Design a protein around this ligand. Structure first.
Ligand SMILES: OC[C@H]1O[C@H](O)[C@H](O)[C@@H](O)[C@H]1O
Ligand SMILES: OC[C@H]1O[C@H](O)[C@H](O)[C@@H](O)[C@H]1O
Ligand code: NA
Lengths: 346, 339
């Protein structure tokens, strides 16, 4: 079933329930996921109204871009030309600049395919918006099926050579309470290397580091507490995790990551080369989620994209988008029950 | 009473009915007026869904900008520097460039004051959007009251020196049917001068012209057909009227124009110095409104703003907006019915 209602400020809330009774909801404000519940329990973080997003934190669950992550000094080279983008985090351009796509009302249309329902959000980034050459016609399709798979499909075309590397900013918290740390969740991630950050400004260091056998090694499932408790320089630098992880094997067919809590698991699939993992290292900020003060480490993202820093570390990839060329990216989050035995105590 | 409903593509339709039973409706798609009716008759042109506007014509009833009108070669000078805006009509920048603010979904909040109801639409134009320096935080408040006054109040703030001169693009048709020319309406307009167009590109010609005692003088009420049957080269040029008229006296208190058809009249008030009047000179286009095929002259606008062409005729004014300065504008469309 599909249901729609006003969500506030002119935004709408689109709620889907699949045949298994799992419900998930989105809003056109930032083509974003608002909630995902199983048996009355929230699997992710979200607010109850549009205003909350604009007043507390506009990122959760949003579609972010045109370029996700930090661009050192907002400087990009496009077809032999240097371009300076809006700098909204010191001299850095973070998640596309100020008042970016995650803050806009996107138009949308719903396609009911029976076992699958698709919500296609659309938006045009005008040429020059926040320094980005365009215009760029973008679309984000969020779909949910009877198999409990939530898929995000991005598409985009530009009138001019530009840069494009968006991502989905959902935060998971299998505890279903933001006031509960995710250190109790088990994490498995098919990545042998990571990208260290230079300092508190969080731009990339310039090197790629192997993490096998360190506290950041999750190739084999381990509790998140291991990382949180680590005194490795990078962990301390960011007070948790906030880094791009380079996937060892690419392809949408492979389970790149799996997050488990007791009988529930979320598997991550994507066609992107890295996963930026941010563990809500907010300290005592205590943003309220459903009247619960969120704790430090009260959530975890899996931002699949081309790793940030490619401006400095060419090896990470090329986020350039040629005029007329069609961009596409696909990321999938699938829900499972009793996928494995996870019986721990914190 | 207030009613909110889905207008399509995720856009909303906000309908306001006052004590008099008059109904006015708006959509966040382009902070625009969709309908205005009395006793079941539409006073303005509009569509029945969001899609239609996107597919047929996106300007009707919309808020247009940042700059309304045509800018020669898309060129403006800001703080002594030349800036090239998005060009969407040949080398001209028309109505702020392609995919402008009239095609975006604005956020909004409704405020019920009893005798009056306000609907405040907001949108942020990012710095650099379509070549315009910013960011510009814009808000357009459409309000409707028990006196049948529809008021538009504009406000904006920019982080950088820029240009700003928006307008409301409603088309009136007291016939209540697009298939019917407005030639039968009577118009009065407090303007003795106008701005002639250079040619078919519709950019300004360069001069200001006195219209006193011409087919374009409406200082004294007159029927539209007059203007429409005039052989003035300017009329002949655009096949109707598509020009900025320079108001004689400035100020919100003075009724600047009046459109009348029988018992029904619309008065226009503004704090702007000019009114651009366009008589839907669409030829055989035939755009469909409420299943009615539109006729040439099947509508008329009252675009209140600073006259287009100030880039070439500074006497017309200046549309710059310095960083940190607050822009404000107001335009009123008052409805009256004789007894
Ligand atoms: O709150 C948004 C969040 O987005 C990414 O994960 C960044 O790496 C974090 O530093 C933070 O900016
Ligand atoms: O269609 C929108 C309309 O906008 C103004 O009124 C112009 O003068 C007309 O030429 C036309 O372009
Ligand atoms: Na809506």
């Amino acid at each position: 079933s599909i249901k729609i209602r006003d969500f506030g400020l002119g935004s709408d809330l689109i709620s889907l329930t699949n045949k298994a009774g799992v419900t998930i909801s989105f809003t056109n404000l930032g083509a974003r996921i608002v909630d995902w519940q199983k048996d009355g329990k929230h699997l992710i973080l979200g607010f109850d109204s549009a205003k909350e997003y604009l007043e507390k934190d506009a990122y959760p669950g949003a579609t972010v871009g045109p370029t996700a992550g930090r661009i050192k000094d907002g400087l990009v080279k496009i077809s032999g030309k240097d371009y300076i983008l809006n700098q909204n985090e010191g001299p850095q351009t973070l998640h596309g600049g100020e008042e970016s796509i995650h803050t806009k009302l996107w138009t949308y249309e719903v396609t009911d395919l029976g076992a699958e329902v698709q919500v296609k959000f659309s938006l045009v980034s005008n040429d020059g918006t926040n320094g980005y050459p365009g215009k760029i016609e973008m679309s984000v399709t969020h779909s949910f099926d009877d198999d409990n798979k939530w898929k995000i499909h991005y598409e985009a075309i530009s009138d001019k050579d530009t840069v494009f590397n968006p991502t989905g900013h959902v935060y998971f918290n299998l505890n279903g309470d933001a006031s509960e740390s995710v250190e109790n969740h088990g994490l498995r991630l098919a990545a042998s290397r990571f990208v260290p950050l230079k300092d508190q400004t969080e731009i990339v260091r310039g090197d790629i580091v192997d993490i096998k056998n360190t506290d950041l090694d999750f190739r084999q499932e381990k509790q998140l507490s291991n990382a949180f408790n680590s005194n490795m320089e990078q962990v301390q630098l960011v007070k948790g995790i906030n880094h791009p992880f380079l996937l060892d094997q690419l392809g949408l067919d492979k389970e790149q990551a799996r997050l488990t809590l007791d009988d529930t698991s979320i598997s991550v699939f994507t066609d992107q080369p890295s996963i930026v993992i941010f563990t809500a290292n907010f300290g005592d900020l205590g943003t309220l989620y459903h009247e619960k003060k969120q704790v430090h480490h009260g959530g975890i993202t899996f931002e699949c994209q081309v790793s940030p820093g490619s401006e400095q570390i060419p090896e990470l990839g090329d986020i350039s988008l040629k005029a007329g060329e069609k961009y596409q990216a696909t990321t999938i989050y699938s829900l499972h029950t009793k996928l494995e035995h996870h019986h721990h105590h914190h």
